[PDB]
Amino acid sequence: AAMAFTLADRVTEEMLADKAALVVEVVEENYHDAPIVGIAVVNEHGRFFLRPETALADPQFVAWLGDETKKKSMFDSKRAAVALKWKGIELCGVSFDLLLAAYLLDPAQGVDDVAAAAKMKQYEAVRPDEAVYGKGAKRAVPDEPVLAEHLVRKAAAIWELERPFLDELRRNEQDRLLVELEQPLSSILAEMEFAGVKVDTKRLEQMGKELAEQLGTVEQRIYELAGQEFNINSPKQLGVILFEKLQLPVLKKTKTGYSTSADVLEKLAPYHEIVENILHYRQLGKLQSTYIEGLLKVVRPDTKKVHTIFNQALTQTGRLSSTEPNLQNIPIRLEEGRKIRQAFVPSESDWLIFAADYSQIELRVLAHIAEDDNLMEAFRRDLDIHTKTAMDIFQVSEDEVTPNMRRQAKAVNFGIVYGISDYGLAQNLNISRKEAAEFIERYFESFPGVKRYMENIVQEAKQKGYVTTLLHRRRYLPDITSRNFNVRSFAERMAMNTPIQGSAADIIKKAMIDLNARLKEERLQAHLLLQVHDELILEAPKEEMERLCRLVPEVMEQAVTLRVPLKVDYHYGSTWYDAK
DNA sequence: AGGGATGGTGC
DNA sequence: TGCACCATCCCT
Ligand SMILES: *Nc1ccc2c(c1)Cc1ccccc1-2
């Protein structure tokens, strides 16, 4: 059963062929400045295992790594690329990434290691990473003999699986999506994570101090109003105080005890002064624990930068996700939380933060795919889409649209952009399900194209078994045929929503690639720092702002050509908060 | 030490 | 609780 391979003590020319499966193993989940525990190379000349201290110190090996003409096939090349960036080594020539290939073929499979991908093609001569490294506290790098065989088997699997994976992608008409979009994007994300974002820790620490003070104040007030002290953070104890001791009404139940979510508390506020204080306590606590303390934990003391990791092969819609820290969910809606963004600053003196965001890309994509005459005309006129929606569903003139009418029309659009359930809408409008469905009915009368699209896409999902995005990303929806109403309804919502969310993801991804090509052609020092679904955040010398103001929006707006224009707004300032 | 339940940020 | 990540509480 054992797999043959050479445990090399030195690097040989045979190991530097122009085509090979390459494994540069980084076991630590966060690969930033992390160790490379071993190297495996599989090519036409055989299978080899190399100790990192040796390989990475060899001029020839390093040169082979950085030679774009020497093609490598890998699994999660970004992990290797970044780990190597921290060591000052450039990785080039990656022509195939099995992780991204598996992700495109079926995001739902949840492929996170070579074994999971190989299993898709009935290849099982390789162990799951968790089985070799263990999990959690018991996690550890095994002895060399065990380590080396694992890495060689992973390289071997990649070597064998490249062809079948590429062939299926071609059949799915997704080979260009891999080769021209995701793989090039992987290199861009690597540069972004490696660059990182500078943090004003002093500012964060001072905010933390002020929060602790307000938190202590509110906390005492809460005990005062409750007549005793308790753990405000335990839904259990909190429930006893609110619903038992204070006799507040139970408007919502939970599969445990009482519900204490913000939306529930807001409704209870009129009954007792303790409620508003609990709401306020949570607001501050969220900022303190999750953002202030959470951010300070991951900032690198030597550079005062945070280096997020963009998971490129996770979401079911084609979006990226961000972790340790998650820089895609920094507060902005409420002013108090928004202030957190003042802590994110340019990495160089006299540089500024520049942010560009698509204006309603999801609804513009919807107008395009549904070919709805009314919605397309609205965007061609660059109308306020919520006011316009209110005018149509309520049958009134623009001057007749009240603030509440626009708010509810906006809730309807928010529901369509995110594919929320009918139940989620009724509450967002704080009305009855019967009345909610009635709003949707009026919307379809005003946007019959959107109606037809929703009906047609659900039918297509059932027929083909999946739905696709503009650039051919796909999502299988097996629940679309379920006889369970709730399970089927969810699948139907995804059939409608994935082409919208997924196409928006495809577009901004291509925009990033197009943008980097333009920045290079122009020799601008500006560079991408973050992507937050429908917006790109960069930093650059103050002297490049005027040029970026014209270049970034244009590139983002021209990434793709739709039946309606794409519109991008932009701002810049001394901190992220200022890049309004 | 893990991890499910609940709650809250973002798009 | 649409797509995500992660905080604290608290049972096992
Ligand atoms: N996608 C989605 C699903 C359910 C719910 C929302 C969005 C918002 C909300 C508010 C209250 C209950 C349920 C939901």
Give a verbal description of the structure.
The strands form five sheets. Strands 1-4-3-2-5-6 form a six-stranded mixed sheet. With 580 residues, it is of the alpha+beta class. Helix 14 (361-370) packs across helix 15 (373-380). Helices cover 51% and strands 13% of the residues. It has four domains: 1-194, 2-Layer Sandwich (Nucleotidyltransferase, domain 5), CATH 3.30.420.10; 195-309, Taq DNA Polymerase, Chain T, domain 4 (Up-down Bundle), CATH 1.20.1060; 310-360 and 505-579, Alpha-Beta Plaits (2-Layer Sandwich); 361-504, 5' to 3' exonuclease, C-terminal subdomain (DNA polymerase, domain 1). Bound molecules: 2-aminofluorene. Residues 418, 420-421, 423-424, 427-428 line the site of 2-aminofluorene. The structure holds a DNA duplex (11 and 12 nucleotides).
User: So, the CATH homologous superfamily of the largest domain?
Assistant: Ribonuclease H-like superfamily/Ribonuclease H
Distance between the termini: 61 Å
CATH architecture of the largest domain: 2-Layer Sandwich
Largest sheet: 6 strands, mixed
Beta-strand segment tally: 17
Any ligands, ions or cofactors bound here, and which? 2-aminofluorene
How many H/I helices? Answer: 22
Q: Assign an overall shape.
A: globular
| CATH fold call of the largest domain | Nucleotidyltransferase, domain 5
Q: Structural class, please?
A: alpha+beta
> In which order are the strands of the major sheet placed?
1-4-3-2-5-6
Classified by CATH, the class of the largest domain is Alpha Beta
User: Radius of gyration over alpha carbons?
Assistant: 27 Å
Helix content: 40-55%
- How many domains make up the 3D coordinates? 4
Q: Please state roughly what percent of the residues sit in beta strands, choosing from under 5%, 5-15%, 15-25%, 25-35%, 35-45% or over 45%.
A: 5-15%
Region (Subtilisin large fragment): 8-580
Region (Polymerase): 173-580
Keywords: DNA damage, DNA repair, DNA replication, DNA-binding, DNA-directed DNA polymerase, Exonuclease, Hydrolase, Nuclease, Nucleotidyltransferase, Transferase
Catalytic activity: DNA(n) + a 2'-deoxyribonucleoside 5'-triphosphate = DNA(n+1) + diphosphate
